[PDB]
């Protein structure tokens, strides 16, 4: 009675993993290597389509991680190596204009450096931030000398994030979840199809998420398994919290030639008073924001429980402290002032002290160190806190502490709405015709 009929161009798909390529509209992200974007991108709403999404098993996260690292490493390939700098240093304290916040934070180190001719030497002195220098026995060495080589970052290449769009190849498509209050793992009743994601800024931070997307209706709490303790909790905020960061010192940057065409940059001196770097968070905004987080946590922990916030328990500075790139300098800000409260059912700011490092080991790797040359003048940046990464301690009281450290969890906060599927245009069904 019925016969097989073959159809081609059938609107079906399968979960699939493929390689995505970048689109992007002198940058550590090498955006000149990416495809120009569509000025009028399409988005096709799919009526009556419900899809299963799982942000924790999303391979787009892994590809972003690999591309970010590879772009980062490529940007250092043509830059001056600092092998000649791993020498014994003779260091004394910078005591000239200390406000007692900075005692012992800056050291004045002299050394013998190589020069353009290999049969000559020059005596150079510079200032270091302590975290980059370790004692040998007044004899000091740079901290990386017993672990890794250092490459100086090129002074002409910006580290500022530029939005990157991830695009599927022909034959593949990216489905986007449009539901509000979407927790990352359930079915998504309202979806649409795009070919490229929106641009995502590769912002690197360790405890708070900066300059991301906001939730529209409420604070959304997402985790792979909220009853475990082995998993981090990603909190997406509804409103931004503005944070003002500064390195309030006027640096004079000097440079020397250490070989043929090889320049080294360092801080020569500081003009005026020496003060600690710090970040400002308004108390009123922070208090409301944290209260919203608590309200949402109660949906899983009880309306009769106690929610306590505390400092990270310990570990490397890159984990326990909130790290970010501000104007080219790398800041390590203490968030103990943000997570110090117990919740039981004005222009008054919070000041977070910050430390600065020049020798940086990124992506939690060993053997590849970068030297961040100093920035001349005074640095100030303003950014938005759009989310948090928290962990929960293993009674009646739950305790949450800043987590993070692992970069893939930052990208999950932007990529949670997307999945890649393969288009399968060929298929069969019974019908009445035959031939």
């Amino acid at each position: 009675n019925l016969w097989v009929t073959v159809y081609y161009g059938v609107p079906v798909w399968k979960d699939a993993e493929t390689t995505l390529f970048c689109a992007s509209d002198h940058n550590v992200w090498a955006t000149h290597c990416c495809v120009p974007t569509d000025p009028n991108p399409q988005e096709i709403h799919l009526e009556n389509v419900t899809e299963e999404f799982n942000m924790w098993k999303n391979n787009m996260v892994e590809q972003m991680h690999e591309d970010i690292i590879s772009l980062w490493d490529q940007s250092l390939k043509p830059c001056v190596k600092l092998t000649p700098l791993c020498v014994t240093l003779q260091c004394t304290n910078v005591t000239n204009n200390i406000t007692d916040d900075m005692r012992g934070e800056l050291k004045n180190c002299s050394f013998n450096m190589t020069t353009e001719l290999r049969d000559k030497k020059q005596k150079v002195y510079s200032l270091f931030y302590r975290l980059d220098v370790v004692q040998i026995n007044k004899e000091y060495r740079l901290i990386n000398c017993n672990t890794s080589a250092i490459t100086q970052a090129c002074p002409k290449v910006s580290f500022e994030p530029i939005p990157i769009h991830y695009c599927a190849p022909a034959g593949f498509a990216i489905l986007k979840c449009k539901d509000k209050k979407f927790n990352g793992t359930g079915p998504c009743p309202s979806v649409s199809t795009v070919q490229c994601t929106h641009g995502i800024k590769p912002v690197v931070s360790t405890q708070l998420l900066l300059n991301g997307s906001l939730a529209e209706e409420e604070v959304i709490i997402r985790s792979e398994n909220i009853t475990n303790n082995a998993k981090n909790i990603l909190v997406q905020l509804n409103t931004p919290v503005q944070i003002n960061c500064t390195r309030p010192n006027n640096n004079t940057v000097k440079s020397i030639r250490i070989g043929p065409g090889q320049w080294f940059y360092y801080t020569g001196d500081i003009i005026g008073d020496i003060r600690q770097a710090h970040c400002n968070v308004s108390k009123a905004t922070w208090n409301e924001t944290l209260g919203k987080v608590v309200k949402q946590l109660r949906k899983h922990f009880g309306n009769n429980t106690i929610i306590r916030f505390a400092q990270s328990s310990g570990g490397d500075l890159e984990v326990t402290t909130h790290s970010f790139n501000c104007g080219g300098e790398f800041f390590y800000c203490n968030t103990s002032g943000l997570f110090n409260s117990t919740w039981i059912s004005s222009n008054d700011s919070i000041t977070l002290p910050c430390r600065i490092k020049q020798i940086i080991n990124m992506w939690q790797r060993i053997g590849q160190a970068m030297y961040a040359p100093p920035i001349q003048g005074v640095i100030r940046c303003v950014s938005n806190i759009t989310g948090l990464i928290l962990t929960r301690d293993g009674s009646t009281t739950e305790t949450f502490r800043p987590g993070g450290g692992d970069m893939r969890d930052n990208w999950r906060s932007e990529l949670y709405k997307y999945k890649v599927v393969k288009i399968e245009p060929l298929g069969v069904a019974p019908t009445r015709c035959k031939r």
């Binding site: 016969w3 009929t5 995505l20 390529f21 034959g171 298929g427």
Partner: protein
């Protein structure tokens, strides 16, 4: 009207009227390797589907009626239940275990047809 995959979720009978919407989007210095792999892969997938249409005698068509009867063991759902009350995503799941059977039948049928045509054309 609808863009790519905009018909998904509509019933099969409706979705069949937009087949060219999807057909037209197929096929449409280390980092050059990713781009070439992406481009080559799209071509390979395109060609594999086209090769099957060739083998089955459906080359150049979006809709191809063949000579293989439908077996109720694959599915015994009524046509009014299939074409009007299901979408293609649902249909694909319902018969996903029988596609290899069906494909084998389709290629064998065409092979027999190739041979019968050849013999009829040998008569003066």
């Amino acid at each position: 009207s609808l863009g790519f995959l905009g018909a998904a979720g509509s019933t099969m009978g409706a979705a069949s009227m937009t087949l060219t919407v999807q057909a037209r989007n197929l096929l449409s210095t280390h980092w050059g390797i990713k781009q070439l792999q992406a481009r080559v892969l799209a071509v390979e997938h395109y060609l594999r589907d086209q090769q099957l249409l060739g083998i089955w005698g459906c080359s150049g068509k979006l809709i191809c009626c063949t000579n293989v009867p439908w077996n109720s063991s694959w599915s015994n759902r009524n046509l009014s239940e299939i074409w009007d009350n299901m979408t293609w995503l649902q249909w694909d799941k319902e018969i996903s275990n029988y596609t290899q059977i069906i494909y084998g039948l389709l290629e064998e049928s065409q092979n027999q047809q190739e041979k019968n045509e050849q013999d009829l054309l040998a008569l003066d």
